[PDB]
Write a protein that binds this DNA or RNA. Structure first.
Ligand SMILES: [Zn+2]
Lengths: 129, 25, 87, 206, 96, 117, 62, 97, 217
RNA sequence: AGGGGAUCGAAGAUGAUCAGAUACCGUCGUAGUCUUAACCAUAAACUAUGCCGACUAGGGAUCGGGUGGUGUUUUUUUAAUGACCCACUCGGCACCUUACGAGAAAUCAAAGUCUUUGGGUUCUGGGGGGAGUAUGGUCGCAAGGCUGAAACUUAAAGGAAUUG
């Protein structure tokens, strides 16, 4: 059965870019998906996306604009001490000057760069680059 | 020898060793 | 790719496909650069002055090479009523 | 972009419906569905001829702008278009390739047929898959004459047609020649027909 | 996927299941059955000193061919009978 | 069996290609031509060759041979490849479209005389 | 397999290699001196070669 | 390695099928396997229809046929070259000759 | 005296094309080894290994020599050539040619701070030639090339100073490892960092700019 | 254990074959083969491929259901029904082509989305032997099933492909 929704989603996105596709249909929608795409689109990795109101759970149509190599989930959502944030970004990102490990803190879902500044930490949701 | 018949061999062997032990109750 | 005092280091800035914006690699020999001419006042095509698209080896092998151009053409105002966004 | 004299003009549309290039293939094949207008009863597909010509103009548009006219290789192993590509190559600088294509042309520079073009035209992507494959080892754009059920791999701008014989291959090749001559070359006044018959691109046998 | 629990709470299973597989490894299992203390001729000790009983002319295996000069020894701390090889040209004459 | 080798047949293809007008249908005359336009090391070969050159000749003058073409033949094929009647498009009684193909022209902006099927 | 072979010739060859005494020589330098010897020798003057240079060649090819 | 994506013959989505006995061997073989050839001939054979139709009664009559569906196992079908070996590729062709 | 037999070869000798990148940029199939010989001389070459391989004939046997050559300066360019032939001397020779015709461009970068002249790699990269996967990782200055000698040399000529390598699979079948570290650095110019999101209008291609001077007889 | 016991047929007997021939071939035939009431728990019990979820590609067949077609064919007059034809859509046993991708390869629409390594979850393997052995426990009337070592030994054992 469905066990992540957010992993199901980022997958379809990856398989879309890979196969040269320019759009995706993401079912179902969810808050965690939404704020994730925000962190993605705000950094220029996707285009516009658009929720669809079925009286159920949602759908999204995202616009891929190339330049996306891999957006991924990390499962389970591991607990990350603030000093271990580094050892993740070291592990699952290409170089020290781009790409993002987007987390989830009690100060809201955000990328590791930002959360570094706000001096917050928490659980790790996934990665983008 | 063929795996099947080596099985048969060790089967025989077992029963025989079982006997030998029983020789002392 | 900059550096310290803003200088442009690194060998060469690669082309980028016009259908996927994916880099066209140095050895991508299924990559294709179609050159399309511009017509002036009635017929008489202009030499030297092109409309150029860039297709990557991957889009072409997949057979989308055609349909990509149609969408890419109309967009740049080169065709009409051929390609249709809704399918 | 291209004005309005480049529109339909039912002089041309008459040629096409006369040459029956509007009749298509029963097997659609997904990459070719936009060209489909509608399906006849008793299983037949009708190409949207406006798109044919529209693509055709784009085809001639790409044949032109190629500097040297003689390395725009026109190719046909098929017989129904063998004489045709010859006549095109006559009126254009373009070099022709009739008969067997010969594996090793585009790659392999020792061969006594090392064409090194910058554009390729193809009558049938099936029966000429050899050169289409070869073209994609060496960075070569490809115009192609595709019916409804044609392979789309490594063809770029594809002109919908019929290529099931008769006067279809002959016409599109004729129209390509007429059009590349109206562009840049020496025809001018795109409103008047041609002294050259369109029946000059038909097969022999006889 | 991957065929192992990923849950945040699956630590016991992960911990115990590796404990369970550490046995397919010799050195580990050899270290927990205390085999060196039990089976080995030395007590796991690096050396052991014994008394020579007889000389042996052991023939080597294929595709070699020679007589390999050894002695049967009774280890003092065990009473264990072990056979050891006297090395170098004619060193067997040094031992009696 | 008498199967001529490639060394022979090669010389045969080569001569005819660049010496068709001079070559004839007769062995004896051909044989003498070879001594004027080709350096051959033994008499039999020259006779062997000149005999095969005439073999191709006697069937060139009977239709084109599979894989050899000279100037005088190329010209002959060019002329004959230009025949054009009173057209065969035309139309001798309008166009005879089926239907829906008629819906095509209507949904296009075009004149033309029509028909049904 | 067979454990009782012949102990008769226990050291046949050491006992028949004709003892030849060591020809004396000047002592080689120890410590830093020796490494100095090796720096200079091996790559400052450069002697014997082949397109590879050779450490210990016996009486060459000629 | 595997030599046929059909393994032996076609079972695919079943489990078990009942056996037949080779018409030559008597060997058992799953009916899904077993090289099967229909055999239909003439009771009177080709050469003898003459002396038959001549010597008979009835206006020409109408020759009967014997109907016999043969089942061979692999070995007997191979050896009697009812089937033959094909190249790694030729094997694929399921088309009758 | 080199005699150009292809369109691309002519333009180089004709001096109209002066730099290697011009070909890499428009992605052009180099087929005349003299091309890369002029556009990049002072280019070094080293024979890595020469292993023998063997066959068997309609009677007995057959045995010939296999060479593996790496060519490159020490800046952005390297190629990998494998050639087995009836001689030592031959196998090297035709190896260098195959190596040069396969010359590749290399996107070096900075591990962290961009303080004058790149030292390592843009991103992490990795190739795989049959089981053996090689993985190159950025490294601080001083780190050096951390690899197995064979790969270490391929990278010295590749123009690298600091890197970390991580290799899985049969690292002992030499010709397989090198073929994957090659694919590795060749993939650097394939990875789209945001350094390159910026769009261009696409150059014309010197085969059309100097089209006349390019044509044949 | 009772019934049954045509057929075929372990054991056994014979006839040949062979140097021998306890066999393959022929003949005879016990048990068995079938059933009822109890056991047994194993097979290359195979797709040698865990299950649930998602996504990535083209194509024509077919089984079941449904929808659409002033389609076809049936009476005495062409309405219902029936079967059939075309399109579509679910859910099935499969098949064909391709390779973007994967593999050591053979090959694979999964064995793909894996050093750009994390959707959930069960199970098993850790060089070859010794050995499925010994010992203990347990289940079975028995045959055996499940569970299951070590001493010592060994540099290979093994997979796919290649050319002879
Ligand atoms: Zn049989």
């Amino acid at each position: 059965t469905r066990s992540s929704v957010l992993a199901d989603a980022l997958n379809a996105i990856n398989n879309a870019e890979k196969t040269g596709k320019r759009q995706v249909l993401i079912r179902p929608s969810s808050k965690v998906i939404i704020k994730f795409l925000q962190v993605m689109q705000k950094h220029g990795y996707i285009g516009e996306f658009e929720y669809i109101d079925d009286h159920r759970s949602g759908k999204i149509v995202v616009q891929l604009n190339g330049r996306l190599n891999k957006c991924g989930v990390i499962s389970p959502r591991f607990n990350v001490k603030i000093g271990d944030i580094e050892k993740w970004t070291a592990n699952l990102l290409p170089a020290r000057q781009f790409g993002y490990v987007i987390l989830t803190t009690s100060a809201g879902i955000m990328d590791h760069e930002e959360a570094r500044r706000k001096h917050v930490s928490g659980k790790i949701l996934g990665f983008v680059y | 020898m063929r795996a099947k018949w080596r099985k048969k061999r060790t089967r025989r062997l077992k029963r025989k060793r079982r006997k030998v032990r029983a020789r002392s109750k | 790719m900059e550096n310290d005092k803003g200088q442009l280091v690194e060998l060469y800035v690669p082309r980028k496909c016009s259908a996927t914006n994916r880099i066209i690699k140095a050895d991508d020999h299924a990559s294709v650069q179609i050159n399309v001419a511009k017509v002036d006042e009635e017929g008489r095509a202009i030499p030297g002055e092109y409309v150029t698209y860039a297709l990557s080896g991957y889009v072409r092998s997949r057979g989308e090479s055609d349909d990509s151009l149609n969408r890419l053409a109309q967009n740049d105002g080169l065709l009409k009523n051929v390609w249709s966004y809704s399918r | 972009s291209l004005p309005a004299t480049f529109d339909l003009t039912p002089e041309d549309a008459q040629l096409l419906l006369a040459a029956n290039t509007h009749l298509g293939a029963r097997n659609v094949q997904v990459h070719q569905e936009p060209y489909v207008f509608n399906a006849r009863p008793d299983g037949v597909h009708v190409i949207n001829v406006g798109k044919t010509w529209e693509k055709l103009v784009l085809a001639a548009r790409i044949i032109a702008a190629i500097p040297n006219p003689e390395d725009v290789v026109a190719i046909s192993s098929r017989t129904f278009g063998q004489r045709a590509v010859l006549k095109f190559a006559a009126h254009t600088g373009a070099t022709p390739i009739a008969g067997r294509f010969t594996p090793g042309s585009f790659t392999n520079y020792i061969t006594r047929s090392f064409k090194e073009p910058r554009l390729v035209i193809v009558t049938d992507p099936r029966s000429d898959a050899q050169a289409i494959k070869e073209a994609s080892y060496v960075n070569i754009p490809v115009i192609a004459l595709t019916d409804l059920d044609s392979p789309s791999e490594f063809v770029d701008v594809a002109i919908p047609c019929n290529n099931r014989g008769k006067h279809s291959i002959g016409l599109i090749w004729y129209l390509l020649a007429r059009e590349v001559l109206r562009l840049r070359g020496a025809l001018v006044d795109r409103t008047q027909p041609w002294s050259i018959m369109p029946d000059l691109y038909f097969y022999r046998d006889p | 996927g991957k065929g192992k629990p990923r849950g945040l709470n699956s630590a016991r299973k992960l911990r115990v299941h590796r404990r369970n597989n550490r046995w397919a490894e010799n050195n580990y299992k050899k270290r927990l059955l205390g085999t060196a203390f039990k089976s080995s001729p030395f007590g796991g000790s690096s050396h052991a000193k014994g008394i020579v009983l007889e000389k042996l002319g052991i023939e080597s295996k294929q595709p070699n061919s020679a007589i390999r000069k050894c002695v049967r020894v009774q280890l003092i701390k065990n009473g264990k009978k072990v056979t050891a090889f006297v090395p170098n040209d004619g060193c067997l004459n040094f031992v009696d | 069996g008498r199967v001529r080798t490639k060394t022979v047949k090669r010389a045969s293809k080569a001569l005819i290609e660049r010496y068709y007008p001079k070559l004839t249908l007769d062995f004896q005359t051909n044989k003498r031509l070879c001594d004027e336009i080709a350096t051959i090391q033994s008499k039999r070969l020259r006779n062997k060759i000149a005999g095969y050159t005439t073999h191709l000749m006697k069937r060139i003058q009977k239709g084109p041979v599979r894989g050899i073409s000279f100037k005088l033949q190329e010209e002959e094929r060019e002329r004959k490849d230009q025949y054009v009647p009173e057209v065969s498009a035309r139309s001798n009684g309008v166009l005879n479209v089926d239907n829906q193909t008629s819906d095509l022209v209507k949904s296009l902006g075009l004149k033309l005389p029509l028909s049904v099927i | 397999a067979k454990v009782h072979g012949s102990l008769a010739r226990a050291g046949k060859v050491k006992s028949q290699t004709p003892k030849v005494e060591k020809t004396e020589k000047p002592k080689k330098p120890k410590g830093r001196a020796y490494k100095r010897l090796l720096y200079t020798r091996r790559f400052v003057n450069v002697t014997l070669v082949n397109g590879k240079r050779r450490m210990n060649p016996g009486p060459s090819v000629q | 390695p595997k030599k046929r994506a059909s393994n032996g013959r076609n079972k695919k989505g079943r489990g078990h099928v009942k056996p037949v006995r080779c018409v030559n061997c008597s060997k058992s073989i799953p009916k899904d396997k077993a090289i099967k050839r229909m055999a239909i001939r003439n009771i009177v054979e080709a050469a003898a229809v003459r002396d038959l139709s001549e010597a008979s009664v009835y206006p020409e009559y109408a020759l009967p046929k014997t109907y016999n569906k043969l089942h061979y196992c692999v070995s007997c079908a191979i050896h009697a070259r009812i089937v033959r070996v094909r190249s790694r590729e030729d094997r694929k062709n399921r088309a009758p000759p | 005296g080199w005699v150009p037999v292809t369109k691309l070869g002519r333009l180089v000798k004709a001096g109209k094309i002066t730099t290697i990148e011009e070909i890499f940029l428009h992605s052009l199939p180099v087929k005349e080894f003299q091309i890369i010989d002029t556009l990049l001389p002072g280019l070094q070459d080293e024979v890595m290994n020469i292993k023998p391989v063997q066959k068997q004939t309609r009677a007995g046997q057959r045995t010939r020599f296999k060479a593996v050559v790496v060519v490159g300066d020490s800046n952005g360019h390297v190629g990998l050539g494998i050639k087995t032939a009836k001689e030592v001397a031959g196998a090297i020779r035709a190896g260098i040619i195959i190596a040069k015709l396969s010359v590749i461009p290399i996107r070096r970068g900075y591990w962290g701070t961009n303080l004058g002249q790149p030292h390592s790699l843009a991103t992490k990269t990795t190739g795989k030639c049959g089981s053996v996967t090689v993985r190159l990782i950025p490294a601080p200055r001083g780190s050096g090339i951390v690899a197995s000698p064979a790969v270490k040399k391929l990278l010295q000529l590749a123009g690298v100073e600091d890197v970390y390598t991580q290799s899985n699979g049969k690292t002992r079948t030499l010709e397989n490892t090198l073929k994957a570290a090659f694919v590795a650095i060749g993939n650097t110019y394939g990875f789209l960092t945001p350094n390159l999101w910026a769009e261009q209008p696409l150059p014309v291609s010197p085969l059309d700019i100097y089209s006349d001077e390019a044509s044949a007889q």
